[PDB]
């Protein structure tokens, strides 16, 4: 009744027996490597976690990530296919996503308008809305974690990396700690105030701003000054690039980039916003070449730093 009760969570050799390990894709605690299941042949991405070292707190964080990934089955979230416990290592086996970052694919297009921005943000908000409904907060929405499923026509945007995700109690806010990425951090996390689901919508507003113009609404080289701007919601819509952006897109950005999280738009309401919801009649169809060029520089900057 050990293996009968624990089942797929019981210690085993399921990974070593049923999969072959191939190259490293990334690294950070853990490594993500491509792998191929033998029995019915298919490609996956195994996150590999060395468990010999781990503290009680790190086990809880690993179990949390595993649980959260198991729970989330949505076309715009990268699916966990298995969670395998072996003697010294744990393996989270995910779908392999081969289309690369969303932001990289955008700069490679012939045409790119608001209507394409809205289409991306529609998919991104569907994933955020899904996780919020399941009382999960991602806490680290950013370009690096918005991937395309495949290089194929019509590939979905997929949310990745729930390494920082938290489970919340319905709509209750608490101090869950200082986590996230500088440029996308919410005022409430910087204030050290209680928080929850709204923090992910703040991040979506920053992403949405970048999808429209190709540069971030908040930046300073001095991180103390960056954080002051974010707390003050010190962004704007400079001309000339913002002059051709529809007032509807601007409206959605303002609602997402609202300092007080209680007043900030929800994912569910953002999905009912006309620019998202009635994209076809509301979103502009004019190509935004200046956005593609800024995005190129935005991607290069990030690549040059990493
Ligand atoms: C090309 N590719 C696909 C994936 C990937 C992938 C993940 C992509 N990320 C985000 C990591 C964002 S690179 C960063 N700067 N941080 C993950 C974090 C934790 C577990 C898995 C993944 C996933 O779920 N399926 C996949 O195919 C991946 C993961 C790490 C590095 C490259 C990579």
């Amino acid at each position: 009744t050990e293996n009968l009760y624990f089942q797929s969570m019981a210690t085993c050799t399921r990974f070593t027996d049923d999969y072959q390990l191939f190259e490293e894709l990334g690294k950070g605690f853990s490594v993500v490597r491509r792998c191929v299941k033998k029995t019915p042949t298919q490609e996956y991405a195994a996150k590999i976690i060395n468990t010999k070292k781990l503290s009680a707190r790190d086990h809880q964080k690993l179990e949390r990530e595993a649980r959260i990934c198991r729970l989330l089955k949505h076309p715009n979230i990268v699916r966990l296919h298995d969670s395998i416990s072996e003697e010294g290592f744990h393996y989270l086996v995910f779908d392999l996503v081969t289309g690369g970052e969303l932001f990289e694919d955008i700069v490679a297009r012939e045409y790119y308008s608001e209507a394409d921005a809205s289409h991306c943000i529609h998919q991104i908000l569907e994933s955020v809305n899904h996780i919020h409904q399941h009382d999960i907060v991602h806490r680290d929405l950013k370009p690096e974690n918005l991937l395309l499923a495949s290089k194929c026509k019509g590939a979905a945007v997929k949310l990745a990396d729930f390494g920082l995700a938290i489970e919340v109690q319905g709509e209750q806010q608490a101090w869950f700690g200082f986590a996230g990425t500088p440029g996308y951090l919410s005022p409430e996390v910087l204030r050290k105030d209680p928080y929850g689901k709204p923090v992910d919508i703040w991040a979506c507003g920053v992403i949405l701003y970048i999808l429209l113009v190709g540069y971030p609404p908040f930046w300073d080289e001095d991180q103390h000054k960056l954080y002051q701007q974010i707390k003050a919601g010190a962004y704007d819509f400079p001309s000339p690039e913002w002059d051709t952006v529809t007032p509807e897109a601007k409206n959605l950005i303002n609602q997402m980039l609202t300092i007080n999280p209680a007043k900030r738009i929800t994912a569910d309401q953002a999905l009912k916003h006309p620019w998202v919801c009635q994209r076809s009649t509301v979103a502009s169809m004019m190509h935004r070449q200046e956005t593609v060029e800024c995005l190129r520089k935005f991607n290069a900057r990030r690549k040059l730093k990493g």
Side-chain angles (χ1 to χ4, degrees), residues 1-2 4-26 28 30-37 40-52 54-56 58-59 62-78 80-86 88-109 112-152 154-224 226-227 229-289 291-302 305-306:
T1 67
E2 188 187 325
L4 195 33
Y5 182 68
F6 298 157
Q7 303 256 111
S8 74
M9 289 180 178
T11 300
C12 70
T13 64
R14 183 156 73 251
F15 190 83
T16 294
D17 295 352
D18 296 344
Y19 295 78
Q20 189 167 324
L21 223 28
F22 290 98
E23 83 278 355
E24 180 174 315
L25 312 176
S30 66
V31 175
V32 185
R33 292 179 78 184
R34 182 173 74 77
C35 67
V36 179
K37 192 169 178 192
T41 314
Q42 202 180 353
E43 290 187 314
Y44 298 100
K47 179 184 176 157
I48 309 192
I49 304 106
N50 177 20
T51 65
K52 306 148 206 176
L54 297 174
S55 63
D58 292 322
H59 277 293
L62 167 63
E63 276 147 39
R64 187 163 82 235
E65 169 170 16
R67 179 165 59 262
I68 286 169
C69 293
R70 187 79 182 283
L71 290 173
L72 299 169
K73 305 281 146 263
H74 188 269
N76 296 115
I77 301 167
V78 183
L80 183 74
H81 168 261
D82 206 348
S83 186
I84 310 160
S85 209
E86 297 201 348
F89 291 90
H90 197 90
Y91 305 82
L92 302 177
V93 189
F94 292 98
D95 283 358
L96 192 83
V97 302
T98 54
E101 274 197 38
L102 172 60
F103 277 31
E104 296 286 338
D105 179 83
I106 289 163
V107 305
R109 308 188 182 189
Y112 182 73
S113 52
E114 276 176 36
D116 305 319
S118 179
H119 188 252
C120 299
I121 220 73
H122 172 79
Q123 289 174 87
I124 293 164
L125 288 160
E126 288 282 15
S127 77
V128 168
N129 192 44
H130 185 83
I131 74 172
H132 288 176
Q133 290 171 335
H134 288 78
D135 289 340
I136 289 152
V137 178
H138 190 282
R139 294 200 307 178
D140 193 33
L141 264 289
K142 53 176 172 188
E144 291 77 5
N145 287 337
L146 296 172
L147 299 181
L148 286 162
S150 62
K151 291 196 173 299
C152 293
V157 175
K158 281 176 180 289
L159 194 53
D161 197 351
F162 289 73
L164 279 170
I166 52 144
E167 291 162 309
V168 295
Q169 303 289 290
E171 320 305 341
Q172 298 174 27
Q173 316 291 285
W175 181 241
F176 296 100
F178 190 66
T181 301
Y184 306 89
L185 277 173
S186 65
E188 63 272 25
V189 172
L190 292 179
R191 278 189 258 109
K192 318 228 151 303
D193 287 347
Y195 67 91
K197 289 166 192 188
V199 314
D200 287 343
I201 302 298
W202 183 273
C204 293
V206 175
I207 287 164
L208 178 50
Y209 190 107
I210 301 156
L211 289 167
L212 295 167
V213 294
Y215 59 78
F218 310 108
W219 187 257
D220 202 291
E221 291 291 327
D222 183 353
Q223 178 158 111
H224 167 67
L226 172 57
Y227 290 169
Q229 288 173 26
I230 290 166
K231 283 187 278 169
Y235 69 97
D236 70 330
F237 299 140
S239 305
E241 63 271 20
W242 282 95
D243 296 352
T244 49
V245 176
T246 57
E248 291 80 15
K250 286 166 175 165
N251 174 287
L252 188 52
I253 282 150
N254 293 330
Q255 290 196 71
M256 296 179 125
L257 297 184
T258 291
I259 289 166
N260 191 342
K263 295 174 186 172
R264 185 181 299 153
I265 199 175
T266 68
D268 192 59
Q269 290 296 305
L271 282 168
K272 295 179 169 83
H273 186 284
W275 191 76
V276 175
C277 184
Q278 300 164 53
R279 150 173 58 267
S280 51
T281 43
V282 177
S284 184
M285 300 264 255
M286 88 140 192
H287 181 55
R288 304 190 56 78
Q289 178 67 12
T291 298
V292 176
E293 292 183 346
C294 289
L295 252 185
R296 278 208 264 270
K297 287 181 181 70
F298 178 79
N299 294 341
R301 197 84 200 162
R302 290 161 48 229
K305 292 174 171 179

